[PDB]
């Protein structure tokens, strides 16, 4: 999430794909 | 906070206004 940014949804961009975004906030909450 | 940068204070800036900043850490710590 620090390297990328969110804008809109995935129903507009042509050729878009799926992946898993590793949020740095997640493991720190579980630590 | 990810789209704005903090510097100085609200006494030196001329014509500054007041607003609420969305802290991404707030709903994550509450969740």
XYZ file of N, CA, C and O in Angstrom:
248
model
N 0.812 -1.210 0.000
C 0.000 0.000 0.000
C 0.849 1.264 0.000
O 0.376 2.312 -0.455
N 2.084 1.193 0.501
C 2.967 2.352 0.482
C 3.585 2.571 -0.892
O 3.941 3.706 -1.231
N 3.723 1.508 -1.689
C 4.278 1.635 -3.032
C 3.215 2.003 -4.061
O 3.540 2.633 -5.074
N 1.964 1.626 -3.823
C 0.854 1.847 -4.742
C -0.161 2.795 -4.106
O -0.004 3.234 -2.965
N -1.206 3.115 -4.866
C -2.295 3.948 -4.380
C -3.593 3.504 -5.039
O -3.597 2.964 -6.148
N -4.700 3.747 -4.340
C -6.020 3.273 -4.749
C -6.746 4.391 -5.480
O -6.659 5.565 -5.096
N -7.466 4.026 -6.541
C -8.278 4.986 -7.284
C -9.320 4.208 -8.075
O -8.967 3.480 -9.010
N -10.588 4.355 -7.704
C -11.652 3.679 -8.418
C -11.708 2.191 -8.096
O -11.186 1.715 -7.084
N -12.363 1.458 -8.991
C -12.553 0.015 -8.881
C -11.942 -0.676 -10.098
O -11.482 -0.031 -11.043
N -11.948 -2.006 -10.067
C -11.356 -2.822 -11.118
C -12.344 -3.180 -12.226
O -12.083 -4.114 -12.994
N -13.454 -2.452 -12.340
C -14.442 -2.668 -13.391
C -14.351 -1.633 -14.507
O -15.279 -1.532 -15.315
N -13.260 -0.866 -14.570
C -13.081 0.198 -15.552
C -11.796 0.008 -16.351
O -11.789 0.151 -17.575
N -10.696 -0.310 -15.671
C -9.397 -0.415 -16.329
C -9.400 -1.623 -17.256
O -9.837 -2.716 -16.876
N -8.910 -1.429 -18.478
C -8.841 -2.497 -19.472
C -7.515 -3.228 -19.305
O -6.461 -2.597 -19.172
N -7.566 -4.558 -19.313
C -6.380 -5.369 -19.142
C -5.923 -5.538 -17.711
O -4.849 -6.112 -17.485
N -6.702 -5.062 -16.737
C -6.290 -5.137 -15.343
C -6.271 -6.590 -14.888
O -6.960 -7.449 -15.454
N -5.466 -6.870 -13.861
C -5.285 -8.220 -13.335
C -5.507 -8.213 -11.828
O -5.782 -7.164 -11.235
N -5.385 -9.384 -11.206
C -5.576 -9.561 -9.773
C -4.259 -9.954 -9.114
O -3.386 -10.562 -9.741
N -4.124 -9.596 -7.841
C -2.939 -9.925 -7.058
C -3.300 -9.774 -5.583
O -4.466 -9.563 -5.233
N -2.297 -9.895 -4.713
C -2.458 -9.731 -3.273
C -1.555 -8.597 -2.810
O -0.333 -8.666 -2.978
N -2.157 -7.561 -2.231
C -1.421 -6.410 -1.724
C -1.053 -6.670 -0.269
O -1.926 -6.956 0.560
N 0.238 -6.569 0.040
C 0.740 -6.789 1.395
C 0.738 -5.453 2.127
O 1.634 -4.626 1.939
N -0.272 -5.241 2.966
C -0.380 -4.015 3.744
C 0.610 -4.074 4.907
O 0.527 -5.003 5.720
N 1.558 -3.135 5.034
C 2.454 -3.177 6.204
C 1.741 -2.989 7.532
O 2.287 -3.386 8.568
N 0.545 -2.399 7.538
C -0.184 -2.213 8.788
C -0.700 -3.534 9.348
O -0.930 -3.644 10.557
N -0.889 -4.545 8.491
C -1.467 -5.803 8.960
C -0.529 -6.561 9.894
O -0.944 -6.875 11.023
N 0.715 -6.893 9.518
C 1.554 -7.680 10.439
C 1.936 -6.941 11.708
O 2.212 -7.595 12.721
N 1.961 -5.608 11.694
C 2.262 -4.863 12.910
C 1.131 -4.961 13.925
O 1.388 -4.971 15.134
N -0.119 -5.036 13.459
C -1.236 -5.250 14.372
C -1.217 -6.656 14.956
O -1.590 -6.847 16.119
N -0.790 -7.643 14.172
C -0.690 -9.021 14.633
C 0.584 -9.291 15.425
O 0.686 -10.345 16.061
N 1.550 -8.375 15.404
C 2.790 -8.556 16.147
C 2.565 -8.331 17.637
O 3.304 -8.848 18.475
N -3.285 11.561 6.013
C -1.877 11.714 6.356
C -0.953 11.226 5.248
O 0.163 11.737 5.119
N -1.391 10.254 4.448
C -0.583 9.750 3.346
C -0.523 10.707 2.164
O 0.354 10.543 1.309
N -1.426 11.690 2.097
C -1.467 12.658 1.007
C -1.077 14.069 1.424
O -1.015 14.950 0.558
N -0.819 14.311 2.712
C -0.433 15.625 3.208
C 0.801 15.497 4.091
O 1.029 14.462 4.723
N 1.592 16.569 4.123
C 2.844 16.624 4.866
C 2.730 17.674 5.960
O 2.188 18.761 5.728
N 3.240 17.348 7.145
C 3.175 18.234 8.301
C 4.477 19.020 8.390
O 5.562 18.473 8.158
N 4.370 20.304 8.726
C 5.543 21.155 8.873
C 5.133 22.449 9.558
O 4.129 23.060 9.179
N 5.907 22.860 10.559
C 5.634 24.122 11.228
C 4.397 24.035 12.102
O 4.135 23.022 12.760
N 3.624 25.120 12.111
C 2.408 25.202 12.905
C 1.429 26.133 12.200
O 1.757 26.764 11.190
N 0.218 26.215 12.743
C -0.857 27.005 12.158
C -0.848 28.461 12.616
O -1.815 29.185 12.352
N 0.220 28.908 13.281
C 0.360 30.304 13.679
C 1.192 31.110 12.692
O 0.979 32.321 12.559
N 2.128 30.463 11.995
C 3.011 31.170 11.071
C 2.377 31.283 9.689
O 2.582 32.275 8.981
N 1.606 30.276 9.280
C 1.035 30.267 7.937
C -0.031 31.348 7.833
O -0.846 31.533 8.748
N -0.027 32.067 6.714
C -0.958 33.165 6.476
C -2.128 32.644 5.652
O -1.933 32.028 4.596
N -3.344 32.892 6.130
C -4.536 32.468 5.426
C -4.873 31.001 5.568
O -5.632 30.475 4.746
N -4.338 30.323 6.584
C -4.578 28.897 6.747
C -5.970 28.674 7.323
O -6.520 29.541 8.017
N -6.546 27.507 7.031
C -7.892 27.151 7.458
C -7.813 25.909 8.342
O -6.743 25.345 8.571
N -8.977 25.494 8.840
C -9.113 24.327 9.696
C -9.875 23.224 8.966
O -10.798 23.490 8.194
N -9.476 21.983 9.222
C -10.105 20.827 8.596
C -9.771 19.593 9.427
O -8.950 19.646 10.348
N -10.413 18.476 9.090
C -10.189 17.191 9.738
C -9.415 16.287 8.791
O -9.820 16.099 7.639
N -8.308 15.733 9.278
C -7.451 14.847 8.497
C -7.829 13.408 8.812
O -7.949 13.030 9.986
N -8.015 12.605 7.769
C -8.303 11.188 7.946
C -7.012 10.436 8.244
O -6.134 10.330 7.382
N -6.897 9.915 9.466
C -5.738 9.131 9.862
C -6.018 7.664 9.559
O -6.941 7.095 10.161
N -5.288 7.007 8.648
C -5.544 5.574 8.422
C -5.270 4.709 9.640
O -5.832 3.612 9.740
N -4.426 5.165 10.567
C -4.149 4.397 11.774
C -5.326 4.387 12.740
O -5.417 3.482 13.575
N -6.234 5.372 12.648
C -7.339 5.440 13.604
C -8.303 4.271 13.442
O -8.527 3.538 14.421
N -8.906 4.029 12.270
C -9.835 2.890 12.168
C -9.150 1.540 12.264
O -9.812 0.555 12.618
N -7.854 1.456 11.961
C -7.140 0.191 12.091
C -6.904 -0.163 13.553
O -7.048 -1.327 13.944
N -6.541 0.824 14.375
C -6.379 0.577 15.804
C -7.716 0.287 16.472
O -7.770 -0.476 17.443
N -8.800 0.884 15.971
C -10.125 0.608 16.512
C -10.653 -0.748 16.060
O -11.396 -1.398 16.803
N -10.283 -1.187 14.860
C -10.733 -2.474 14.341
C -9.966 -3.618 14.996
O -10.393 -4.772 14.954
